[PDB]
Write a protein that binds this DNA or RNA. Sequence first.
RNA 1: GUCCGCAUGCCGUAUCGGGCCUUGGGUUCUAACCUGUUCUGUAGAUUUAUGCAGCGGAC
RNA 2: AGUGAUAAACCGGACAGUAUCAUGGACCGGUUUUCCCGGUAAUCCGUAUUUACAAGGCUGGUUUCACU
DNA 3: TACCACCAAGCCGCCTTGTATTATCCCTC
DNA 4: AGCTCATCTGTAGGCCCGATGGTGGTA
DNA 5: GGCCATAAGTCAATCTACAGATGAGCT
DNA 6: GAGGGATAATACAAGATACTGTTATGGCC
Lengths: 311, 318, 319, 310
Amino acid sequence: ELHYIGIDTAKEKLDVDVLRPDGRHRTKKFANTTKGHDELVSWLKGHKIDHAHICIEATGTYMEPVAECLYDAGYIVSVINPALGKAFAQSEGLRNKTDTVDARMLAEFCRQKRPAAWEAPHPLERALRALVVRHQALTDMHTQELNRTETAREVQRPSIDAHLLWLEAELKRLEKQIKDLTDDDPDMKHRRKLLESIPGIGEKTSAVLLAYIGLKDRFAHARQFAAFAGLTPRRYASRMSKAGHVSLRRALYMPAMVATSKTEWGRAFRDRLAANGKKGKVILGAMMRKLAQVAYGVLKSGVPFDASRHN
Amino acid sequence: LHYIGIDTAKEKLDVDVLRPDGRHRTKKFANTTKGHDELVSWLKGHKIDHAHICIEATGTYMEPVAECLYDAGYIVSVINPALGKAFAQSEGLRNKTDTVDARMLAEFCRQKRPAAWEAPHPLERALRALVVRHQALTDMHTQELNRTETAREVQRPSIDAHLLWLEAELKRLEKQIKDLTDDDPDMKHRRKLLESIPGIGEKTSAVLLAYIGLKDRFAHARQFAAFAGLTPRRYESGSSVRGASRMSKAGHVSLRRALYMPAMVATSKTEWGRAFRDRLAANGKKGKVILGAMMRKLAQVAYGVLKSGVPFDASRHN
Amino acid sequence: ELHYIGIDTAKEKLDVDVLRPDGRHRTKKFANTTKGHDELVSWLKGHKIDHAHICIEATGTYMEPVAECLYDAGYIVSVINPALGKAFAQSEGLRNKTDTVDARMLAEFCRQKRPAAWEAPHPLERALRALVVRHQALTDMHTQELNRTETAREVQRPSIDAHLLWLEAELKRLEKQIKDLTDDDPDMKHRRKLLESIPGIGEKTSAVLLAYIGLKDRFAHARQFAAFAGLTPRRYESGSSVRGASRMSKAGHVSLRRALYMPAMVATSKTEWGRAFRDRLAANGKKGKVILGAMMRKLAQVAYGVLKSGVPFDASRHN
Amino acid sequence: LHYIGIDTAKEKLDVDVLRPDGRHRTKKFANTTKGHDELVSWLKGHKIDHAHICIEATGTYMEPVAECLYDAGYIVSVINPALGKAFAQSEGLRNKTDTVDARMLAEFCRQKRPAAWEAPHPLERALRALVVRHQALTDMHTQELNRTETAREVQRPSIDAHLLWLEAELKRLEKQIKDLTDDDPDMKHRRKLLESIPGIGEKTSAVLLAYIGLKDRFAHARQFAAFAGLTPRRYASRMSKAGHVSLRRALYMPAMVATSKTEWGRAFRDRLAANGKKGKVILGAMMRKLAQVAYGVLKSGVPFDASRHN
RNA sequence: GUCCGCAUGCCGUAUCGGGCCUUGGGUUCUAACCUGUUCUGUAGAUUUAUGCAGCGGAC
RNA sequence: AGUGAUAAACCGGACAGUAUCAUGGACCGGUUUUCCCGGUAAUCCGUAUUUACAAGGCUGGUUUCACU
DNA sequence: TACCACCAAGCCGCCTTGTATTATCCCTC
DNA sequence: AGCTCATCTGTAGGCCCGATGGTGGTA
DNA sequence: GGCCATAAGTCAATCTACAGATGAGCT
DNA sequence: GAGGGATAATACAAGATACTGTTATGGCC
Ligand SMILES: [Mg+2]
Ligand SMILES: [Mg+2]
């Protein structure tokens, strides 16, 4: 008696498409609002829909409250990568894109593919991720202003200098904020301490890795976490896939340089690939993938980085 | 019910059966009359009576195996290869190969349960073949016409000779097409109906009939318009995304191209066509936009008139 | 007796190529430093090169000190748009060794084209431009943070709010520094006051316009200044067959072009002369942004015209 | 010396004179024998006897006026259109109109002083015309031959009929080309020299002889290879492709025949093969080589000597 | 008829952003091996088609 | 909300082509601090047809109307 | 005298399966 | 505890959204 | 009845010169 | 000695300029 529901989301309104077991549809649109979300649940309970599998695109801020609302109401929620949604529309040979079309498409996606259920993240996991990506935003702004000092006019330098001081101070207090968060929870404190034991990974990288791994082991294999960062190769003469979080992939590049240059186990890996005629950037690409796997490996193991296991 | 996918090449067929229990059977065959008879036997040898075959429309090399299995009594689906590629990308995010194998086609078949393909009538097949041939010679004739305008005098005898040959051959095919449609009572009747529409003549009636066929395969005339790839493609999301509607173009090019010059004639020289043009002109539509719209109109009316079984009644339109 | 010199510039190194009247070349490489600039001038006097025309390409701020050095040495200096150079290279042959432009190619550009002489801008013109460009940079940084408040998480919001306060204060401080600069000079004070008399141009736009028009009248016609902003249409016509619809050329200063867009909306919407303009083009069946595109050009020309006239904006001239 | 620029179209000419003083005179004309006589009279009516005209190679619409002015005694240059466009961009021109481009060609002429154009020999024009026609019919024959692969049975009679017609016509031109070259004693001798090269047959010799004239108009053989667009350039290096396409396309199959079935060709292949070079890359190189050797052999005036490539 | 002046007509779709999602493949089998070119930037340059219409001035 | 009808209305820029142009980098000699004159069928640099061609596949989004 | 919100909002379909050219050597009649 | 150095042809996909300035109108 | 002119026909600025990150080991 | 078949090569992709035809219908002979 499982219903299949699809929800296209916008800032202002939601479009809901219920696909019944019999095969008929029920469609209704709601305000993307706490009130509106309460109406949606009542409307589903209205038609005696208790068992259902809702499917939503991952479009960010505007779809998160309703996903949580329905999850709490006790329905199976799936939050799918939008690129899959696009490919699925093309596979269904659809000739229009509208909100009611999308909602209907998502209900079909849900039925045909039966996606894995979505788990709402832990409030600490959300907190840490928010701080980390904020820290990245400020770093980018600091780097922009540093570039400007190179070719600044003398009348502009007072302004740039002032801003650089502000940004430096802000980055410090936010680094402390991140440290306080991980220290307060005994699990995150332990896991972060493990991550830092890896030579090539320090205070900054550990916090980024921990923001995406979380405080649970959600991946079956370390290789999957490497794929999740978009670091595993793809035949397309193979290239780095880049199908994954950019925040992870940007965070591991300097760790990879420090590893292949300054560490024993890194230099070992660098030397071996260099023998096979691999280029510098190619080796860094490979080491980024390796750091990701070891990071997840070490946490799953639960014991500090053992060098014996490498080289 | 089994779900079977067939990957096809010139020489080899790759087959993948998906059993109700969830296990697979795989086997390769030669893409020949022998290997088709081997394929059917192999299926019966695993007591596979009911199956849904999914083949992708990859040239004409898949045509004889599809007919073989349709005659063997299986449900055959010949799918647009663009759907297959899209299906693979919907199954995974990074995936591998970015190619559609027999296994992927079996999974496509199982999930989507696509509409059953039907082998065309020999006359439908002949008419389509003649129309396609006619369009090829027209394009060659245009190539040679273009050459006359900048030809050197030593080239000109050769070009003129070829133009005469091409003109005579086009004349011969048109007659061959007319003899085809006149002989069958149904095609003779259906071609009259199409030609009753203002803006549709001998050339276009043959092209429309070549794609519509003897039977009424489309439930609605809108679907035939979509089949030609003439409908607008709406692109809307929330408040932010406003994509200006462009013509979809997701359909037969040979059918779409054949309706352009009729659309000009209709909008310029017929009452019902001018009426249509004038209305859209008032709503501030540009020239080719209106032609675009008229092309879709002609497709939709062409199918409509055939279903009605009655000559074009102008009172139905403004 | 005029020589033609091309200088290929890098951050660290200068590459010089003299083309002599007789046709032979003199090449010598220098450091891109105050020392190497005085070395360069001495090397030219070494080869008794008194009258020359020097052609440098506009590749950032690294080429600016050498251009001033040679200008002061008394030579004719031309600073060329690098796109011109690349096109010149392609005009010289169908299968050049490389597409890149070198000092030799710049010397040849100089000889054939005889390009317009470059003048080092007035220290005030420099200063005002610098402040205006800084102001746009902070505005963009402010816009990023203001976009972020839309989707921010609650833990992020203190950090964003703090930054928005800092950027607002800093923007206000620069606007004051710009006003102090134009008010101190009697010519800039007067010229700015004329610009702000145009309905649709206020404090911010007047500063940007001055930053590009400058102290003197360096354009001959108003259309040239409109072209300088990349606002003139781009007509593409040939014979009968080839006829592409006109677009905005966009071949000009982006900072100047971006400054005019919101003024154009204000003018076409809320002013008498602006609505008059909007209606005229609306009658001929023109779209919203197409009219705004047109009004941006109109504003640029009127801005230039008003300054030339030396009198406040008269609305009667536009009817 | 005046500098004149003519922008040509099917129907109209746009003429812009640039006087020594720097003043401009502009006038439009019809692209007809009448309008060409009007043009000369208008130039003579302003006492313009010594001038350098600069036209861009825009189809066969500019060929009549170029010959008219050449005969009138002026210096005519017919420039590669790509150079013209690059020159316009170097002048910073935003707009592109016929009046603008006529002025620009006068300025091109003033600054670049390009090489004078020479009207080709009538035999050279005839041979080029037939060879070009032959390539066209071959392409059409190939199209119909591809259709035979997947032709429905109702279509096959039509395709078979057309293939026979094209095959008959192709022979007729090959015969017409040979009757042309055999009549002229210079063409005949030059063609016999070209065929003496292992890898070059009847087809290729006609194409080469169409682009090389009756006379040796390239100072060096390198230049002829460049003229085909077969010399490399860095952007790793690759074939420039900046030269005659008809000439270039004619050399690919001879290059395969050379590097496979001839001593001097295999020798070349082997050397490069044993230097890490790929198959197509060697073909690319052999295409350039054949072009260079072809012009070399003609200039030497003696049959192909293999000892020179041993 | 020519040469100039135009804050004129005709021709014109600005510039920059923000957020979020991502659970490979092969192998000697998951912290091992094979396959692997991060992420984000910064500064500067741009002089009418006056082409055709108007309107005004000089000849 | 279901059923039935849709040749109506709103949302629409089709396809295919043609011709023409193209005087290397370098290396080796003369003069000569690089101009300019000679030489090259050798060696090094080279992924053709500046898009090579053929065939096949493609069952709208809404609105409106009738009845319950 | 200081604060508010409101003007403008685009565009060149996707896939899959195939093959030719010329000149010289080599085999068959 | 603070500073220096390792990597340099190039080649993810997608679904949502906002700001700019100046002026007439309002408080 | 045969032959012929005619209807429709948009494009997304170009270049050149540059830079930083983080973590571990050494002064 | 003529006449016909076989064969060599295969990540991708990177200038300009000027042009034309299709069909069906109402007018015009
Ligand atoms: Mg959506
Ligand atoms: Mg031209």
